[PDB]
């Protein structure tokens, strides 16, 4: 229930959108306009270096907002972020991939074209 910036006419109780979903309801306690947004977004994904290469994995959340790196394609945990760029093999989305390099651990970086 976020703080909205749009006011209603003084005769309405609900509020819908273009997609016809009730996402705005006036609070009867103090006539406060509050927005509605669902919490569960997307699923989970697992980054695996492969068989006979490593054993540890990295878990990627699709559209969930949060070692731990907040990428543009959700939340990525279990893979450290490094500023340099190499050629990427395991795609993730939004221009950043993940790989297993140098011990050695799973890293995430912006791909090189």
């Amino acid at each position: 229930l976020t703080e909205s910036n749009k006011k209603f006419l003084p005769f309405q109780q609900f509020g819908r959108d273009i997609a016809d979903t009730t996402d705005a309801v006036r609070d009867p306690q103090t006539l406060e306009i509050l927005d509605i947004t669902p919490c569960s977004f997307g699923g989970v994904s697992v980054i695996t270096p492969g068989t006979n290469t490593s054993n540890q994995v990295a878990v990627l959340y699709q559209d969930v907002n949060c070692n731990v790196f907040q990428t543009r394609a959700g939340c990525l945990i279990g893979a450290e972020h490094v500023n340099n760029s190499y050629e990427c093999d395991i795609p993730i989305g939004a221009g950043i991939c993940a790989s297993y390099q140098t011990s050695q651990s799973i890293i995430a970086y912006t791909m090189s074209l």
């Binding site: 697992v46 695996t48 054993n55 540890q56 994995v57 878990v59």
Partner: protein, 287 residues
């Protein structure tokens, strides 16, 4: 009949970790070179499992009435057959059908009845003077009995009644389940040379007997056997010996398991789906 014990210094129970243990056949079909996943109560891998001692050197003797959940895992690194059997029930006051699965020196005896169960039943072994052999004489498991229906004997099972203090040489695992009142037994003897920290090797469990009882259950407790040699005065108050043994009690939970059936037809691996993200990735791809 049964007698009461005397208060003494005991040892608190410890907690240990399982390593790929508690895997049995969930059905009675043949599967070869296929990775089949089933929903059934198994023991989760790498879970903190309870540990109970049975060694003398001190005077450790603990037999709590643990609650019987939906399936239990009973593993013992038995060496000199110190443990004897198991008893079951809800209140143990001759009001319900309490089980008694014991293994005497001549034959296995399974009889669920309404035995007048005491506070701490046990098996007593006495060392004869003229005879250099350990023989069981104190058969104090219940006070009396009134009525029951089921009784099973099966084939005779021979065990050794002599207790030692050396290292263990065998490992026995048992799984007890109750689905729709049907009693399930899964066991397999496995040789090993270790004292603790159960190996990471894999071994499935095959059913032995499948009992159609259909009764009520919620609690369980194990039975132990102590020795009465010439060193101890022979009274069950403060002086006794129990040899050296260790049994593990684990509780089964409903998790999906991906089994590895080889070309021969036996389970080889039991990769989970709710333990590790890598295991979930393995079991979602069925590979």
């Amino acid at each position: 009949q049964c007698v009461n014990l005397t208060t003494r210094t005991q040892l608190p129970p410890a907690y240990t970790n399982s390593f790929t243990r508690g895997v049995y056949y969930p059905d009675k079909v043949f599967r070869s070179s296929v990775l089949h996943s089933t929903q059934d109560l198994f023991l989760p891998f790498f879970s903190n499992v309870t540990w109970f001692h049975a060694i003398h050197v001190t005077k450790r003797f603990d037999n709590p009435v643990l609650p019987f959940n939906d399936g239990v895992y009973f593993a013992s690194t038995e060496k000199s057959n110190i443990i004897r059997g198991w008893i079951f029930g809800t209140t143990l006051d001759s009001k319900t059908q309490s089980l008694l699965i014991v293994n005497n020196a001549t034959n296995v005896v399974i009889k669920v009845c309404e035995f007048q169960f005491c506070n701490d039943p046990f098996l007593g072994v006495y060392y004869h003077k003229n005879n250099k052999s350990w023989m069981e004489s104190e058969f104090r498991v219940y006070s009396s009995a009134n009525n029951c229906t089921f009784e099973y004997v099966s084939q005779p099972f021979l065990m050794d009644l002599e207790g030692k203090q050396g290292n263990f040489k065998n490992l026995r695992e048992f799984v007890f389940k109750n689905i729709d009142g049907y009693f399930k037994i899964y066991s397999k003897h496995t040789p090993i040379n270790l004292v603790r920290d159960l190996p990471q090797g894999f071994s499935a469990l095959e059913p032995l007997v499948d009992l159609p009882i259909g009764i009520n259950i919620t609690r369980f407790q194990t039975l132990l056997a102590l020795h009465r040699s010439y060193l101890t005065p022979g009274d069950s108050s403060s002086g006794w010996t129990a040899g050296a043994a260790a049994y593990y009690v684990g509780y089964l939970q409903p998790r999906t398991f991906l089994l590895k059936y080889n070309e021969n037809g036996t389970i080889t691996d039991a990769v989970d789906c709710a333990l590790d993200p890598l295991s979930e990735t393995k079991c979602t791809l069925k590979s």
